């Protein structure tokens with residue numbers, strides 16, 4: 004309910020898989036193979052594997068074939084035979100992957116071992132992106148990973164954001180629910196839970212815990228500025244101090260030096276900043292200067 | 307509540323990670339590889355690693371691939387398996403990273419060790435920045451850092467801005483709350499707190515402390531001038547002295563030498579300076595000259 | 610309150626840090642690398658450090674990369690792990706740093722030792738300056754400086770402006786507040802304060818002192834002339850003597866020789882000088898000639 | 913970072929900061945406020961004698 | 963003769979050893995100036 008939205012469990016993580024493949028069936032919107040040699044080379048490899056040997060040093064210009072990179076996410080506790088979703092991306096001078104089909108492609112880990120096999124039909128949106136697609140249930144798991152879940156008497160809940168008050172809150176909630184000495188905070192990002200030994204008992208424990216509800220404590224005042232997209236966001240802890248501001252073409256609705264009153268809550272901040280009558284573009288510069296001076300009692304992050 | 311907004315804890319810091327990667331799936335808005343050799347070279351390295359050896363000295367001109375630098379922030383107390391956010395930036399003659407996908411990329415520290423692995427889909431704003439993007443939960447932590455948190459009987463709260471009165475205020479507040487001899491100010495930027503030995507007790511202590519409330523004392527009078535953006539900010543401690551000012555095209559609304567009365571509070575300052583009727587552009591020069599003369603009883607900082 | 614606005618403390622100062630870095634992610638507004646060889650050279654160094662060796666003597670023309678100088682201010686009592694603000698400036702034939710990202714950069718002192726590491730996103734104002742930006746909390750402190758604060762029984766308050774009456778006033782105020790023999794004036798710019806031995810007691814002392822209030826004595830009559838910007842400022846001690854003035858195109862509102870009466874206060878000075886009806890441009894020449902003759906009883910400074 | 917020498921070619925201050933140009937006005941000249949820090953001190957015989 | 967020992971034109975040691983700089987005084991400064999003549 005809530006704890007499952009704040010933490011993850013130690014040992015339950017995702018991995019990444021990558022592979023190379025071919026996409027066939029395009030309407031003449033494939034690679035110009037006279038400039039992507041690996042396309043024709045891998046096509047010859049596949050044909051030879053199937054039983055057809057094309058002579059070397061011959062002319063070959065295709066249009067319905069594209070060379071693609073396939074990426075996938077290996078899920079936790081994955082079992083062989085299950086299915087996952089893959090993303091297919093062009094990799095040389097192709098125009099579109101509109102109605103293509105992905106041929107048999109092995110997906111390797113970082114140790115260069117095959118963990119899944121991918122094949123299916125691509126769904127391109129159809130402005131939109133043409134050289135990228137997604138296949139639903141397009142890969143099947145072939146290898147499984149070992150794990151030490153169920154061994155021991157201790158699991159670790161890892162918070163998504165560091166905080167001491169939050170770790171203490173989660174610890175106190177678990178201790179209030181599941182007995183006196185069930186949890187212990189290690190640092191601002193880990194809670195060590197004692198669980199019975201076994202495999203089903205730990206699942207019962209984690210099922211009971213993951214649905215508990217905790218009240219989030221107030222976080223740090225911060226202001227996020229995304230200059231690339233042109234956006235500004237302020238959480239509900241920002242305050243202000245009375246100070247004067249001047250900027251090009253901005254005036255009182257009075258001269259060019261406008262006042263800004265103190266602001267305790269966020270509504271007061273929004274009101275006092277809207278009083279200046281500035282676009283977000285100028286609001287970025289105003290906020291940077293105010294943080295440098297001392298009015299802005301927040302934490303400016305340029306993302 | 308407040309102390310967490312003024313200080314940091316010793317040993318709880320962030321680090322930086324950087325790596326090199328490839329972005330595939332672009333709509334013909336990738337590098338012109340005839341002038342970025344490292345793109346094709348690294349693509350050949352990846353293909354060879356996967357099992358395909360492209361002959362050397364061959365023609366290869368791609369359009370859906372771009373070479374990028376990936377940057378990330380290693381968080382405090384990071385545990386392996388968690389996720390962080392990455393920033394992706396083009397590095398040679400690419401047009402856009404609109405719908406690209408980041409391939410498997412290792413993120414190294416300053417000691418050239420792999421601390422995280424990055425892979426995911428890029429979100430470009432879509433004027434806006436095209437050659438820069440951000441991936442949410444795009445990297446997974448692989449290595450952990452050791453730390454000596456929980457060892458000893460002393461932590462250090464490091465203020466964000468140097469001040470003696472502020473350090474003394476924080477010390478007195480902690481001593482008023484958590485017993486007589488709990489805190490001690492070392493200098494204008496450090497408060498040494500005595501904590502019980504252990505790991506959970508220190509978390510309880512820091513959870514109790516970080517949410518205390520202290521009243522900020524008046525800071526130094528200062529005036530920030532950002533000439534690059536064209537902005538001026540004055541905190542609530544600036545005062546003025548009576549003096550005359552003259553500048554091109556400015557007149558009394560009377561000759562060209564205008565008076566400025568004494569000003570104790572900030573409202574009086576704003577009024578007296580708006581009386582001159584000057585844009586911020588001229589206000590910068592007026593303020594510099596006034597600070598050089600002696601009217602402006604503040605601290606001018608050109609940022 | 611006031612003393613903190615007039616003096617500094619001996620041993621509490623700032624230092625400067627400088628470093629070289631690269632900025633990536635620009636929209637084709639980076640260096641023209643065929644004329645800035647150090648850009649490509651340092652990019653090759655970074656790639657080689659990461660694990661990719663680009664052959665030498667090859668073509669390489671980038672557009673999304675710029676070479677920059679990073680400057681920062683090492684604050685007093687800085688502790689490792691804290692954060693400071695950096696300024697980023699282009700250094701060869703770049704067009705803009707609009708949406709760039711600063712890669713890992715070490716900031717050296719004057720002894721060529723690394724004191725901070727810088728990395729983050731740049732905020733360019735967006736006429737405005739394009740080739741210069743500022744990053745908030747963009748650097749982290751890595752090295753600390755030793756200091757002898759807290760050792761001895763004597764600190765020095767250093768005035769910001771030399772004056773004997775002012776040093777005597779500060780000394781008398783401290784002696785009136787903190788006991789008979791607590792302070793002693795050494796010269797026009799230093800006050801020697803006796804403090805108890807230790808580290809916390811000196812902080813208590815400096816916290817008590819820095820917030821005291823003293824009444825500033827009248828300074829020297831001076832007139833500041835900034836010919837480059839075209840501005841004139843006169844503090845409240847300037848007086849005048851009766852004399853005649855003539856200048857091109859200026860006349861009585863009567864011939865071309867106009868009278869100027871004696872003026873004791875500043876209002877009389879402003880009135881008598883506005884009577885001549887002259888722009889600041891001519892006011893500069895009039896004031897220079899008057900100071901050369903003997904009317905202007907002030908101190909002319911051309912800044 | 914710039915060292916400021918006296919007439920004896922000794923470093924007395926170190927200068928670094930942002931320039932404020934007026935913005936007709938002078939473009940090739942600027943002033944930096946608190947742009948230099950003192951590194952060396954001069955001896956003096958103030959306080960000695962009557 | 964060529965075996966009779968003669969002294970070279972450039973006498974004495976033809977090399978010098980750098981000396982370690984002084985320990986920096988612990989003021990608040992990074993700039994440390996060795997004793998300047």
Ligand SMILES: *C(=O)CCCCCCC
Pocket residue numbers: 963964965966
């Ligand atoms: C070198 O050893 C030559 C010395 C010879 C001089 C005397 C010959 C009789």
